[PDB]
């Protein structure tokens, strides 16, 4: 079963559940940050995400409403960092409390990246890349720098410049991504749990007149689980490459008709992948299998790990045989079973979606990923169990908030949130 660790932000660096870690894009730069291990292979780093931004992007300011909310002071004290961390702990326990979400955590924890990427020759395992390992500071912060590369699957940061813009991020080298090519790679996320999204694209509103339309705010656990689905795809190396999908019509479940990444439509579930032609859908399937072919071909040729002695090649060949559901024969050499590939492909791509997770957790979400951006709101206190719980989110029976998702209804539960204006 999945265990969610507990800790305080000021807890000492013991190098068990709390380390000083150099994250992938900061490799060899010397930038370490206090990291907290919420689960095996999953870390929370309560810092702002800065890589690829200008430092003045965080400070943007001016009667209008914009879709992007900025607040440079977010996470700017240790007490703020600790609130972020405790909120993240609570969101993860929320996810764990149904079989469906605990299973998600487990496939993410077990979904280990291949030891290498496209640059590594077929013969070798190499763990000395930013997408397989991060640097752990093993010396005392007072002493001359000594470090050790550890494995990891997911590292969650606080927001970049735009707070309500949560995003899952893969590692790219020379225009290629291990996370999109069969290998898998360490995944990253910029996440902000109390600045949530608002939506009115719900089927009840479809007939409705303009001043009769309902408005809801999202459950942050669902916002997170959606991001964790991208994370799962990136770990199994099947996260869909740049492929915008253009609809040939507004359909009944749609609200807008803008192009959307195919990765998003599979992640959302519902009816969203019906927009994708079967032709493009088949080639996505074709490409994954080709990538998995490239992986199994490596597994038959790997002789050595060049970076880490104490790595047992036999053990790991077996772990990957489990990850990818490869079949073995009497030579000891692996191969693909297409019938067994289809089971694995389907569960990864269609088994976890935002749509079925919302249904299973009794959470109101939007009717389609093709929905307008609305201004986000701020959830006042997710840590207060009168407002938000682990078992039922905002939709608490004991406060009569369970019926028709009133707990998420902007017109009903106005004490849960405030306008960001």
């Amino acid at each position: 079963p999945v265990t969610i660790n507990n800790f305080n932000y000021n807890d000492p660096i013991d190098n068990n559940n709390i380390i000083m870690m150099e994250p992938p894009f900061a490799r060899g730069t010397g930038r370490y940050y206090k990291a907290f291990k919420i689960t095996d292979r999953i870390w929370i780093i309560p810092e702002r995400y800065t890589f690829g931004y200008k430092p003045e992007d965080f400070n943007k300011s001016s009667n209008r409403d914009v879709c992007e909310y900025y607040d440079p002071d977010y996470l700017n004290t240790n007490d703020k960092k600790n609130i972020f961390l405790q909120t993240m702990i609570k969101l993860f326990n929320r996810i764990k409390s149904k079989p469906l979400g605990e299973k998600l955590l487990e496939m993410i924890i077990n979904g280990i990246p291949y030891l290498g990427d496209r640059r590594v020759p077929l013969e070798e395992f190499n763990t000395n890349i930013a997408s397989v390992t991060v640097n752990k500071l093993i010396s005392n912060p007072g002493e001359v720098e000594r470090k050790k590369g550890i494995f990891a699957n997911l590292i969650i940061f606080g927001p970049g410049p735009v707070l309500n813009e949560n995003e899952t991020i893969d590692i790219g080298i020379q225009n290629h991504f291990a996370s999109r090519e069969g290998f898998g790679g360490i995944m990253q996320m910029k996440f902000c749990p109390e600045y949530v999204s608002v939506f009115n694209n719900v089927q009840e509103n479809k007939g409705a007149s303009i001043f009769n339309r309902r408005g809801y705010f999202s459950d942050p656990a669902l916002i997170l689980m959606h991001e964790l689905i991208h994370v799962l795809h990136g770990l199994y190396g099947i996260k869909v490459d740049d492929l915008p999908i253009v609809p040939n019509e507004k359909k009944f479940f749609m609200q807008s008709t803008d192009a959307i990444q195919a990765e998003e439509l599979y992640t959302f579930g519902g009816q969203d992948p019906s927009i994708i032609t079967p032709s493009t859908d088949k080639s996505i399937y074709d490409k994954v299998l080709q990538n998995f072919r490239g992986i199994v071909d490596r597994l038959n040729k790997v002789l050595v790990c060049i970076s880490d002695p104490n790595i047992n090649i036999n053990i790991y060949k077996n772990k990957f045989k489990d990850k990818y559901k490869f079949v073995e024969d009497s030579e000891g050499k692996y191969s693909i079973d297409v019938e067994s590939f289809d089971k694995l492909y389907k569960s990864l791509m269609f088994g976890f979606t935002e749509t079925n997770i919302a249904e299973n957790y009794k959470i109101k979400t939007r009717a389609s990923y093709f929905s307008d951006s609305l201004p986000p709101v701020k959830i006042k206190n997710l840590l207060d169990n009168e407002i938000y719980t682990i078992e039922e989110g905002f939709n608490i029976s004991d406060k009569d908030m369970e019926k028709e998702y009133r707990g998420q209804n902007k017109a009903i539960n106005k004490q849960a949130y405030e306008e960001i204006s």
Partner: nanobody
Amino acid sequence: VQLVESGGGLVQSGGSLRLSCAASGSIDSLYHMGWYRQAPGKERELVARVQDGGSTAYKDSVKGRFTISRDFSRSTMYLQMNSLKPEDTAIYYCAAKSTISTPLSWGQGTQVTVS
């Protein structure tokens, strides 16, 4: 890029040996240099490694005893093995990688027997 190992042992248990790896070119900048050993009818293992910066790593089973050395001016990598146990008995290779993508070029090997 060529490599030749030397230093061959029939040494007693507890004795020491110095292996040598001679390269046809410069060794200062290589992405990877490492010592490997393969027991009879067993798999190759990485014993000791050096990285392009000079970060060196060792198998647990050999720490304290084996030390990697490097003479640039002679383009040679040494493995200095002390307190060898019978378990260290294998053919020892020396491989080098010019880049992360350059495949390993191996040496012919040098044998180590430990009564």
